[PDB]
Amino acid sequence: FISENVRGIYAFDENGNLIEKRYFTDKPEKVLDQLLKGEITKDLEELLNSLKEKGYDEFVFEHPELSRRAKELGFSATTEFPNIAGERLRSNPEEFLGENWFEEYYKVGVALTRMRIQEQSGARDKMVIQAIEALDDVDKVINLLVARLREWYSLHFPELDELLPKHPQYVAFVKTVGHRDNINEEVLRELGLSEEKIKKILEAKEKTMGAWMDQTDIEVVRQLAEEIDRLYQLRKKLEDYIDRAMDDVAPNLKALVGAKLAARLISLAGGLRELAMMPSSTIQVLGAEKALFRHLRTGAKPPKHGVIYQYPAINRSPWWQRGKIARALAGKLAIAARVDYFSGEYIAEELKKELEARIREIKEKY
Amino acid sequence: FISENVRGIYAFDENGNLIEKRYFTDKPEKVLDQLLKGEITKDLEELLNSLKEKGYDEFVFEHPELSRRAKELGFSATTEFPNIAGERLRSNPEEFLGENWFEEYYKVGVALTRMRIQEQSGARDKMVIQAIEALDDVDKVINLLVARLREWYSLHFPELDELLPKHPQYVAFVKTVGHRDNINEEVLRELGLSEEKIKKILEAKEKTMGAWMDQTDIEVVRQLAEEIDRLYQLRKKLEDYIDRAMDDVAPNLKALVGAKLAARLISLAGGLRELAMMPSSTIQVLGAEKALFRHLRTGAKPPKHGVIYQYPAINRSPWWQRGKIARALAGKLAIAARVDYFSGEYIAEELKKELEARIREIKEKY
Amino acid sequence: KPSYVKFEVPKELAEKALQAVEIARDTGKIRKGTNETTKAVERGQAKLVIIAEDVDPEEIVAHLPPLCEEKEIPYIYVPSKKELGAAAGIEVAAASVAIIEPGKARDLVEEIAMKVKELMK
Amino acid sequence: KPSYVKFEVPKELAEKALQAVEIARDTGKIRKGTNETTKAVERGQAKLVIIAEDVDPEEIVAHLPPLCEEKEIPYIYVPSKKELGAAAGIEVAAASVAIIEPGKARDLVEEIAMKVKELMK
RNA sequence: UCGCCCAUCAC
RNA sequence: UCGCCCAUCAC
RNA sequence: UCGCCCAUCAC
RNA sequence: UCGCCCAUCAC
């Protein structure tokens, strides 16, 4: 009844004609992975509710678990993979996407293969900063090797230097030409030069004042141009890395302790400003409640720990370790709360490593 | 320039005249909690875009940290709490809000104050099912005690029972009016009855067939009506709990192992489906990298743990327990994935309590 | 009653599958508990799988029925996990049990498979 | 350059804040380290607070400037956490130090407060 | 030029 | 203890 | 009817 | 050791 592909979502009847079609409201790989692995997304949800407004009460999908979620959503849903909606779209894609269809299938297939692995840094913005310094350093060494490439190739074709000002167009010219008699109207028009620019170059090749480099020499200058086109491809891999890396952003307290303790410390300080304004030797005892109250009013036993008690090394360990870990944890938390309020920048894998190290030190001690 | 209020957000000029004000597009009690603790909201993003498009730049706010989020995001923001916007708006709301402004202050202020406490039960869907049975059992006791109240009071004034059949209105009559010779035209309007109902009842004041209750016989019937009034307040206490707690949703893996580790483990399995299908013995070794390779290909010792080594009770921990904890963690992890994937209910603090009992037993044994 | 069941049954077939565990254990090849059941399920090798009706939380076995469609093997349920553990010879409980080789019980496991293929339909 | 050093410090008064720590050490009432600074910066009447210029992450002391603007107290800084620890008289480091009573340092705190209040203005 | 194992120690 | 796919370096 | 001190075990 | 606010109830 319903089926999905690279560009959209389609409903066909039990005789075999189209009822309705949708396209995705987010980037296609990001929505299609959910629909491929078996879970529901808003664009398929709006289509199947359009079929419910149009008076269809029974539904047939392709994936067994998307069908399982569809009945849990309140629908008479079942699974039959050979059904007409998918059978038509996958048999005659040129009827729906036209005679170029495989190019859009390609563009999302490679992107899904780039997405079906997890991405989690401890230093993502610092890695982006080193990629930004690499982008100026790469452009700066491209400029250096291009200055040598201009001067050395000017021994063999000196008229070229003023004639091709655009640096990557000079690099790709020397990469593919090598020796000056491989210059033809065809290869210059494949390299995408204008008929005007091709009215020169060829005029100069018939009259050049340059010297002679042998076949054995001029391939070294061709290899210099090929390694500069390697550097220009690395330049794009740096730009495309940053274009992904700016999606992995997060708060620190969620990683160092997680919501059960993070939202408790925020609520017992009344707010996240107030938690960031607190000392470790009060963050230790936030949510000690009746124990903090009577340590004041009746001068009772000082509270050893508050709501931090259910931490992964307190409610489950010997008394010797329970007191020492409580204040060390509250120290590292007083750093983490100030980071998440005043700057919002991510360092929490190092705050974890230091709390691994101090608890390993508590282990070699006790 | 900006002033910060409950009846929307406001902008005024250097001379103290209004420019524009806008009303909120999420629940105002949540919009005030953000703006009071100093983070900025969508309706104020729109009001400062309106103020920018009018041709002003000097964006003085009342609050320092709201002004921090504004200039940290990129706006031309400063701070003065006594600025001419707040000095006008809070001096005379009548010029801007309308004369009943205190109703709008009241209805959101009491809601914010009822809302300023955080929530973290361990299995809250079960802890709300018991309140749905409490609503069934509360109407069940009301529909029992009011039958006794009807039968006893109808000894003295039977002309009311078929005339006030809705049980709360009969209880309010027997609580507040009580003895039949108290009945007059004014106290029935102070009870909220209509003229069509007050022609009757007063009809019976001169001619009832009921037999006499004395001054402290009617008292115990009033005590019963005064306690049944509190059972209607208990019905409000349950209605106000159900409207707050029955909208909750939380993932289990996100609480048992923490969000970043859960999200990583889901991808070393290929998906959350696989993490909900696979055995604990395989879930134990997911993403061990070249240690799993040499166990298969080279016939080495099996790895004790994969990516579960990053779990906050394995990563820091001494050798005697690291393997024992990794096995029980892989079982309890396989359960949490099965709950998030097949059921969509929350039990994660129970799953933690059981692994915490097993960790205490590991200390008690080794 | 749990979510994961796909067809209704009386004590019919179910008491015969519990009886098959009581003779496959010492004439054939068997495993007990749900992670060993799941190893023999995922790598296909379980010829018949038996699961309990009273697992608590119920979710720990909820994969075994759809995963037995995905690999094409018969599955059945029985009324109590403690009695399934006792049929598997152990002194605790078992949420599931897996038959790798029926031993003497081949005609009996083939009856169970042939009559469960009347219900998986 | 960290976000908390919000005014440019000259070749004067910085050494006078270092000296104010040195002579309060045995004669006033004083706290050292940033969490003890934080509680004596909230509670009772602090007189002056001192920070290092090399605190890293800067976020741990980045709270001290806005916390001084809410409560009408002056702050100042000195070139190193290791020198600020040595000024307090401990052989580790200190990110900050707080004065509760100046002892000998009372005329130094009065000169620093007068000169900084008209610098930042 | 490269690899393994027993006892003891640690997270 | 063994199988296949696969990069890279080499004869 | 209730509290306090000291010695001691498990986590 | 010493105070301040709080609900609900008494001799």
From Swiss-Prot, chains C, D:
Record flagged with keyword Transmembrane helix: no
Keywords from the UniProt entry: Cytoplasm, Ribonucleoprotein, Ribosomal protein, RNA-binding, rRNA processing, rRNA-binding, tRNA processing
InterPro entries registered for this protein in UniProt: eL8/uL1-like (IPR050257), Ribosomal_eL30-like_sf (IPR029064), Ribosomal_eL8-like_CS (IPR004037), Ribosomal_eL8/eL30/eS12/Gad45 (IPR004038), Ribosomal_eL8/Nhp2 (IPR018492), Ribosomal_eL8_arc (IPR022481)
Transmembrane segments: none
The keyword Ion transport belongs to this UniProt entry's keyword annotation: no
Location within or outside the cell: Cytoplasm
Superkingdom to which the source organism belongs: Archaea
GO biological process: rRNA processing; translation; tRNA 5'-leader removal
Pfam families: Ribosomal_L7Ae (PF01248)
GO cellular component, one term: ribonucleoprotein complex
Record PROSITE patterns: RIBOSOMAL_L7AE (PS01082)
Subunit-structure text: May be present in up to 3 copies per 70S ribosome. Part of the 50S ribosomal subunit, where it binds 23S rRNA at its canonical site near the L1 stalk, as well as a possible second 50S binding site near helix 25 and a possible third site on the beak of the 30S subunit. Component of box C/D small ribonucleoprotein (sRNP) particles that contain rpl7ae, FlpA and nop5, plus a guide RNA. These sRNP particles form homodimers, giving rise to an asymmetric holoenzyme. Probably part of the RNase P complex.
Function: Multifunctional RNA-binding protein that recognizes the K-turn motif in ribosomal RNA, the RNA component of RNase P, box H/ACA, box C/D and box C'/D' sRNAs. Component of the 70S ribosome. Component of a box C/D small ribonucleoprotein (sRNP) particle that is involved in pre-rRNA and tRNA processing. Utilizes the methyl donor S-adenosyl-L-methionine to catalyze the site-specific 2'-hydroxyl methylation of ribose moieties in rRNA and tRNA. Site specificity is provided by a guide RNA that base pairs with the substrate.
Classification via HAMAP family: Ribosomal_eL8
Family: Belongs to the eukaryotic ribosomal protein eL8 family.
Protein name per Swiss-Prot or TrEMBL: Large ribosomal subunit protein eL8
Organism lineage string: Archaea, Methanobacteriati, Methanobacteriota, Thermococci, Thermococcales
